[PDB]
Every structure is written in C-alpha cells, then in structure tokens.
Amino acid sequence: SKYMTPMQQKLNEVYEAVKNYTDKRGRRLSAIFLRLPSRSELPDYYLTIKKPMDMEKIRSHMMANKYQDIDSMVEDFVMMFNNACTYNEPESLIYKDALVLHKVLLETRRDL
Ligand SMILES: CCC(CC)Cc1ccn2c1[nH]c(=O)c1c(Cl)cccc12
C-alpha cells in the first residue's frame, strides 16, 4: 500500500521540517543533502564513511513503511549529519549547515 499511515504521516512531518528549513537569510540548508554522489563520482567518501546516507534514501525508506518509529528515522538523519561533519572539514559550508540542521532535527523531535 502506497497510502501514508498515521505513523508515516508523523515521520513525514519531521522529514519536511528538516527539508524545508531556511536559515536567517532564507537559505535552504537541506538542498545539498538530498543526493550523495555515487561510488564512481566520489569513491573516497565510501572508503571512510561506513554507512552512506542522503535524504532521498531516508525518504524512500519512510515512504516504503520501513521505519518502525520516529526515533529510527531520526537516527538515520543523525548518521547523515555526522557523516557530513566527518568527511568535510570544519571550515566548510556543508559542515556548518549539517550542524544547524542536526539541531533543527533534534528540536523538532523534542517538540513532537
Ligand atoms: C560540498 C562539498 C562536497 C565535497 C565532495 C560534499 C558533498 C556533496 C554532497 N554531499 C557532500 N558531503 C556529504 O557528506 C553529503 C551527505 Cl552527508 C549527504 C548528501 C550529500 C552529501
């Protein structure tokens, strides 16, 4: 079944909060995180990041009704932002944006 159950609808609220967040200047910080480059495009990422994750993969898992609870999805987002902060250096834009969204995610969960 394709219909979103009540649990999926709650997961999708959290997913949308992260996806649609804009910073104080209107910048959509999620955009870079939708799609990780493939193994052929960025092989060194797959050497050191043991569990590659992007928001397309999370969303597909969510839409397939494969998350058992809100916490399971939050853990994949947390993994994704930790991966970004590991592969990318602290001076980088993506590292800074991963921190902001990681906090948005945690506060969204706490207030749910
Ligand atoms: C911006 C400099 C790019 C340097 C190749 C890094 C780059 C390009 C896209 N993505 C990343 N780094 C990520 O870690 C990452 C993650 Cl978690 C999820 C989805 C996309 C990602």
Curated annotation (Swiss-Prot):
Could you tell me in which tissues this protein is expressed? Widely expressed.
| Transmembrane region(s) | none
Q: PTM Phosphoserine: at which residues?
A: 38
Show the cross-link location (Glycyl lysine isopeptide (Lys-Gly) (interchain with G-Cter in SUMO2)): 2
- Could you say what the effect of mutating residue 23 to E is? Found in a case of clear cell renal carcinoma; somatic mutation
Compartment annotation: Nucleus
* Start and end residues of each Bromo domain: 2-112
Q: What is the disease in the record?
A: Renal cell carcinoma: Renal cell carcinoma is a heterogeneous group of sporadic or hereditary carcinoma derived from cells of the proximal renal tubular epithelium. It is subclassified into clear cell renal carcinoma (non-papillary carcinoma), papillary renal cell carcinoma, chromophobe renal cell carcinoma, collecting duct carcinoma with medullary carcinoma of the kidney, and unclassified renal cell carcinoma. Clear cell renal cell carcinoma is the most common subtype.
Q: Please give the function described in this protein's UniProt entry.
A: Involved in transcriptional activation and repression of select genes by chromatin remodeling (alteration of DNA-nucleosome topology). Required for the stability of the SWI/SNF chromatin remodeling complex SWI/SNF-B (PBAF). Acts as a negative regulator of cell proliferation.
What quaternary arrangement does the UniProt entry report?
Component of the SWI/SNF-B (PBAF) chromatin remodeling complex, at least composed of SMARCA4/BRG1, SMARCB1/BAF47/SNF5, ACTL6A/BAF53A or ACTL6B/BAF53B, SMARCE1/BAF57, SMARCD1/BAF60A, SMARCD2/BAF60B, perhaps SMARCD3/BAF60C, SMARCC1/BAF155, SMARCC2/BAF170, PBRM1/BAF180, ARID2/BAF200 and actin. Interacts with PHF10/BAF45A. Interacts with acetylated 'Lys-14' of histone H3 (H3K14ac), and may also interact with other acetylated or methylated Lys residues on histone H3.
Q: In its UniProt entry, what is this protein called? A: Protein polybromo-1
Species name for this entry?
Homo sapiens
From the entire protein, which fragment is shown?
652 to 763 of 1689
